[PDB]
């Protein structure tokens, strides 16, 4: 009886759809058979607690770690030099698909979080200049809200919220900062005054968002710029799939640029599937064939031409992608060689889950509170983190 893959994944969109088909395609052709799935995580672990995994799973960043610890996972050392993956994959990347020096798991795509969008017919209308640093980011909303624009299109949820905070962390601070604070959770950094000063110019930069904004998706805020309401809205790169969707094109209708003050820096989310420690043959068979396809070129060409992010291999043509991706891909360069290729925390690569809930509360009954005082707040982040650990 022939091998099976079980994919565990959250990847649905119609977009999306093109890429998973060519992975199963593949992995058909090479004889093996297909499936396929869309709190879910829960009943992951007890199906792997008791020998039923799937042969993969998205699962990512530091989970990755854990997943390996508890001996749940698989080693992919005979896949991963049959197709040389060290030598594909940036040493930073490869890190992060390693438990105790084996990997564990593909990745599949690598996000851009440091990015501000801008709408410049809506800058022009305003006399705003686009933004290089934060004095020129104050600027810029300034001139936008005397010519009744939101200036700043953002939701309120807290993952958001720590979206724009990470970035002026990221800005202030500085890449190796961000690191202490975010990675190492080092306490003087985390009660820093630099720390001080990126909570007290969170609660400036709140007072251009829209007071009345709690519980809005980002597409929503992604929609204001679009439709010429706001001006910015400081996001990932997913918010590219936006512009695309209602026939919007780079340069012409929206401008990409680093969040000011981080141009240098990449603050990076990168997806990945774990593969599970498997009992039979012909899965494991199967097992491997996806987790060579998953890291080809067909699959990470089309995976993220339909997703916005960039690809994870080195040796890709970047001009088989588009303008904002291909700013994207240099910035990653640049940042890989220094001291500027940094996870996300927002998006559950710097910390565990429970530390980036603790963040998350701080942020967000933080930027809900007027009051709020940036010298009390850097001790409740401090505080907060340590408990949660």
Known sequence: NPGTVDVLHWWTSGGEAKAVETLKQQIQKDGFIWKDNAAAMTVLKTRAISGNPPSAAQIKGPDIQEWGALGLLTEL????????????LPRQVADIMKYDGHYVAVPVNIHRVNWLWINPQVFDKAGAKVPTTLDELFAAADKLKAAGFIPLAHGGQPWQDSTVFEDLVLSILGPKGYHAAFVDLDEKTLTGPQMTEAFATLKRLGTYMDPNRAGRDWNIAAAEVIN????????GDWAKSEWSAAGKVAGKDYQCVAFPGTQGSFAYNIDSLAMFKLKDANDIKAQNDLAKVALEPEFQTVFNQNKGSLPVRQDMDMSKFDACTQKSAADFKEAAKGDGLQPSMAHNMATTLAVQGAIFDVVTNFLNDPQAEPATAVKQLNAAIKAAR
């Open 77 to 88: 050392d005979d896949v991963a030099a049959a197709n040389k993956w060290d030598d594909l």
């Open 228 to 235: 010429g309401k706001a001006g910015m809205q400081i996001m």
